[PDB]
Every structure is written in structure tokens, then in C-alpha cells.
């Protein structure tokens, strides 16, 4: 989970073969199709007073700059 | 087991009035009501009677014989009468006891 | 028994009107299990009474302060 917005939870991952032919080979057969999840990280921050909490790149970046309710 | 509600636990009469027993045996026979059992539609008018034999086992010197006693009835007796014959009821009002209401048929008493 | 001639009494008298009925009620109950309870009903009454004995007293609990 991040500061601004939650995260994690992701989606499936395919894997095709015969991949790419004359502008188009015969086609792209699939052989995978499963399922996955994507995470991030943290750095200590705080508002009101001292904290720590997780901080998502795409937030520690947005916070590194203009702060929004939260201070780096 | 349903029971005596078909009517409506309402006795069309008092455990004190006088009534003639229409239909069934004891037709036209009358007598002062005694038991007013509404729920069940039970009536004890000095009319019907049976001589029962009491079951008094180790009941202090048994000597149990055959008691004459009244047997209850249902809506089988048409409540109260004045013309000396079964009579509906209808023209109520009140008395010097406006705190109440009466009943009456062709005539008007009870 | 409930009419004003009930409330008509004090707060302690109320108590007095209670702690005694269950002093009767007791001897009664004793009698019972001791054999001789000829006054089954008496019990009920006695009981009944103490209910009101409080029921009423509770009625004051909102009447005189709200």
C-alpha cells in the first residue's frame, strides 16, 4: 500500500510462440496465461508529527516536490 | 387442533339466562344457564343430564356410584327467549344504566 | 394496594411495605415445604404486592426531577 492511493494487486502473464512472421508468420500461439501481482516500497515521512509509513516512488517523487497534505 | 373458534369465543348469552334447546335431543326443553364456557362452546343448562359413575379409587372409602349430573352442549341451544320460543335478538339501547346495552327480539326484554 | 393510599406513604414505609411481605412470604414458603400450605393464593398476592410496592416507587423516580 502507498501514501497516495493503494496498490499491489495485479493481472495475468501470457507467453506466445512462433512469434512474428512475414509481417505476420502464421500467427502467435499462446502457451502461458497465468496470474501475478506488482509491489513497490517505503521511506519514513510524516504529517501532524513524526511517522515513517510506506512511500511509493510515484509519491515520494510527487512529494519530493510539492507536498500534498503530506510532508517528506 | 383448531376448536370452538369457528364461532368466536363469544357466547351468545349469559351463564345466568334461560334458554330453550332447539335441535338435538332435549328439543324445546329449557332451564337456567350454569356454565359459561365460551372458548369451547360449552353450556350447562339444567336441561341435559346423565348419571355418571365417579372414579374414586383409594378415595377414602370409595363407595363410588352413579351421580346425576349435567352434560354440557354447544351452539345447539338458541340463547334466551321471551315469546317462549327461540328468538333472535336485535333492538338494543340502554337503561338508567346507560353504562350498558340490552337485547331483544320481536318484543323487547331479557 | 395501589390507589393513592399506596403512594400516600413514605419512601422507607415503602421499604417497610416490602421487607415485611417477604418476611411473610418466607414463613409462608417455609410452611409450604414443611407441609400445610393451605393458602396457596396468599403467596401470589403477597408477591403481587411487592411488585407494585416497587413499580409505584419507580413511578416517583421520574415524577419529581423528570
Amino acid at each position: 500500500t502507498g501514501k497516495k492511493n493503494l496498490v499491489v494487486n495485479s493481472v495475468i502473464r501470457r507467453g506466445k510462440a512462433r512469434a512474428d512472421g512475414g509481417v505476420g508468420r502464421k500467427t502467435t500461439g499462446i502457451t502461458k496465461r497465468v496470474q501475478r501481482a506488482n509491489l513497490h516500497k517505503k521511506a519514513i515521512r510524516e504529517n501532524g508529527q513524526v511517522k515513517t509509513v510506506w512511500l511509493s516512488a510515484n509519491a515520494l517523487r510527487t512529494l519530493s516536490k510539492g507536498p500534498y497534505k503530506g510532508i517528506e | 387442533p383448531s376448536a370452538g373458534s369457528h364461532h368466536n369465543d363469544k357466547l351468545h348469552f349469559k351463564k345466568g339466562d334461560t334458554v330453550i334447546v332447539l335441535s338435538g335431543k332435549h328439543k324445546g326443553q329449557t332451564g337456567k344457564v350454569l356454565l359459561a364456557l365460551p372458548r369451547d362452546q360449552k353450556v350447562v343448562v339444567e336441561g341435559v343430564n346423565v348419571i355418571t359413575k365417579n372414579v374414586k379409587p383409594s378415595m377414602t372409602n370409595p363407595q363410588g356410584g352413579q351421580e346425576q349430573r349435567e352434560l354440557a352442549l354447544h351452539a345447539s341451544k338458541v340463547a334466551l327467549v321471551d315469546p317462549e320460543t327461540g328468538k333472535a335478538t336485535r333492538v338494543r339501547k340502554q337503561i338508567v344504566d346507560g353504562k350498558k346495552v340490552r337485547v331483544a327480539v320481536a318484543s323487547g326484554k331479557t | 394496594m395501589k390507589p393513592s393510599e399506596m403512594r400516600n406513604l413514605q419512601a422507607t414505609d415503602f421499604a417497610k411495605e416490602i421487607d415485611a411481605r417477604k418476611k411473610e412470604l418466607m414463613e409462608l414458603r417455609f410452611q409450604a415445604a414443611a407441609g400445610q400450605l393451605a393458602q396457596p393464593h396468599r403467596v401470589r398476592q403477597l408477591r403481587r404486592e411487592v411488585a407494585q410496592l416497587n413499580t409505584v416507587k419507580a413511578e416517583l423516580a421520574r415524577k419529581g426531577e423528570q
Binding site: - | - | 418476611k23 418466607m26 414458603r29 417455609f30 415445604a33 414443611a34
Partner: protein, 93 residues
Amino acid sequence: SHYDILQAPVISEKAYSAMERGVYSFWVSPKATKTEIKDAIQQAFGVRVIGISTMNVPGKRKRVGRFIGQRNDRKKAIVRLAEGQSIEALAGQ
């Protein structure tokens, strides 16, 4: 009050026999700790209590009826007055 809690007197023969020696015993209430009970009694019969014994008693009966039965749980308690023998006369019974 005082008169509360005691539930009834213990009839039986022994008990009654125990009485001929100044030991009284009635059924108190289940949850009726020794002290309270020791109290009650005294002040309901005017007298003190030198000793007190108490312990619980289940019940589970019936006559018939696919209704088995059910306990009824009691708590017969026994007290020993001081040389100041007797409780009223609800003893001489």
C-alpha cells in the same frame, strides 16, 4: 434484606435429628456464599452462628414422557448456633 435468600428448611430425618442437638439446616440459594448466608439466618431468627457448612446438589428426574427430565440444583446449608440453642420453635416441629 435478611429474610431473602434462605429458600426453605431441610426436612429429612437426619436433619430433624440434627435439630434435636441444636443444628439447623435449610436449603439456601445456590450462589449464596457462606458469609452472607451466615448473616441472613442470624438476623432472621435472632441468634449467632458458630459454624457453617454448605455444598451443592443436582437433581435430574422424571416419571415418564419422552421428556427425560432436568436437574433442579440446590444448596443445602447447615448452621450451628451457640449454646443459645434453638431457633424460635420452627425446630420442635
